[PDB]
Symmetry: D2
Subunit: 177 residues, 4 copies
């Protein structure tokens, strides 16, 4: 989509269109009945681990700061060795929120498998493709990217992921009643 022929303005406009598409298609895929039960699940979580890698870990930590900001016990950890040990020590009733577009990055898949072995609940924020991460998840929130993989690789994907976490957070706060 974005090519070496483009002016800076066309690039600017192309980028915004990719994010707008990523937001709309992600939104269109939402099962609002399934979104609600997920929020219910997160809300009763004694402990929440949020896993990710690279740019998507920033999305997870963005959400971890917001959940801590309202009294949730949240682990979100960049060091993959440390992230893995947290997963291997989760307990039944805990919640893992796995943010990974591909669903086939080993470290993230290994952490989700460890959560399941320990009996934690796994929520995957991931792309529509059938992936090891999707097959490990109790619930899945689908993210549709709009990007040119060779140019805008961690941009509309991250916008799609941010839209899901933002919604999760607002729906959680809305459970103030």
């Amino acid at each position: 989509s974005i090519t070496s022929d483009d002016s800076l303005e066309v690039i600017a406009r192309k980028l915004n269109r990719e994010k707008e598409l990523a937001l709309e298609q992600t939104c269109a895929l939402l099962d609002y009945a399934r979104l609600q039960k997920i929020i219910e699940v997160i809300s009763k979580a004694p402990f929440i681990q949020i896993t990710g890698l690279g740019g998507s870990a920033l999305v997870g930590r963005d959400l971890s700061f917001k959940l801590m900001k309202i009294g949730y016990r949240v682990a979100c950890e960049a060091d993959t060795h440390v992230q893995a040990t947290v997963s291997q020590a989760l307990k039944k009733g805990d919640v893992q929120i796995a943010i990974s577009y591909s669903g086939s990055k080993k470290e993230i898949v290994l952490c989700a498998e460890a959560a399941r072995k320990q009996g934690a609940t796994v929520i995957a924020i991931t792309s529509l493709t059938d992936s090891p991460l999707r097959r490990l998840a109790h619930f899945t929130l689908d993210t549709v990217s709009g990007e040119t993989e060779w140019r805008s690789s961690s941009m509309s994907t991250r916008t799609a992921q941010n839209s899901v976490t933002d919604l999760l957070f607002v729906g959680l706060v809305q459970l103030n009643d």
Copy 2:
């Protein structure tokens, strides 16, 4: 946007608010100015990216992209690490300061220290006349809610990056 709403109404409302941030931010772009900014970033021996709170995550997000392509970058959530790095900047280096307000003490002092050291300061900030906007060599404006703000900030950094790759690609060829 209010409670009593359903989750679908919230999702749409949040999506529209981001959509407005993307479009009102791009609407103020000065493409001749932005090109000069990319050139400056492109030639920088060293780049510091300052921020705090969510703007720090936006800074790290961009620093990962610049680091992958071999640009020498510092961007650090610890408030006083980030201050030691600004003061240690030298002439010709570049600081990218991301704050919506422009009056946050730490971002202001890091930007002071960076022009004290003779670096170029690029500010990604709101249209509010601010101490940051005054200290900056260049400003890219962001119009935005803390979600919309991060959305607006990311649209500037993402554009700077793809523009940087585009220019660097033109030269290599």
Copy 3:
């Protein structure tokens, strides 16, 4: 310090050794056992610190996480601060600070005690805000900066080993 590198290496090692000796000599093993028991029963544990003593806290955090304790240890102060506001009766805060009077650590220990949690300080001997606010204090004595870290790690490493022994004893 216009000494050789060899003189520097030995001098740094002797400061570290003195920090270990002087810190170990102040240990009260009766209170340490009580402290280990408090930590072991906490549903949630926050470890606070700033600068190098934050790294010390995270070093402990990694080991506690691996054996199943729920532990927050954030090196960003505003994150650390809001994690203190959410503490609950029965939780535990481990506050690591040599001075004992750094505003950010003092503010988190107040919140912890306010919120009903137990505060365990790892701090120098001086009469300090952190020491007055703690339910339990473990002393660290330097050997002079680098030896301060060494002193703090010797207390945390001991807490870690005590806790592992506590479970293998009741296994």
Copy 4:
């Protein structure tokens, strides 16, 4: 079963003893002629990546902040994916300081391979064992443990590493003073 001793006071004394011997034996193993050459090479590095995992990464972070404060351009990154992208982008004349006791941690080994591939100069802070990391290093700084039953524990290993990093920092302040 973590310890063969029953008494906390015995444990505390043995643990401190292990640390005292890790410090002294690592110190005795220093080729102070090499160490000055090593400090000289770090002094000239336009860019310094410090690599590690888990506890060893905290040592590298502690060093990275001391070095940044006296003005050096330093990368030190907990996220193993990002860290790997930094190693892959090093250039000739850059220095990588790889901090791993074992020398056989996949991610540290692959970061040193990438650094050497691209022509960076690799200084390893590692144990004496013949390791993939030691065979890849241009320079080595040996971290060994004490005699006790606590050898090779992360507590002993962190202590030996810290003494080496503390020394490198002080030797650098001495030039740059």
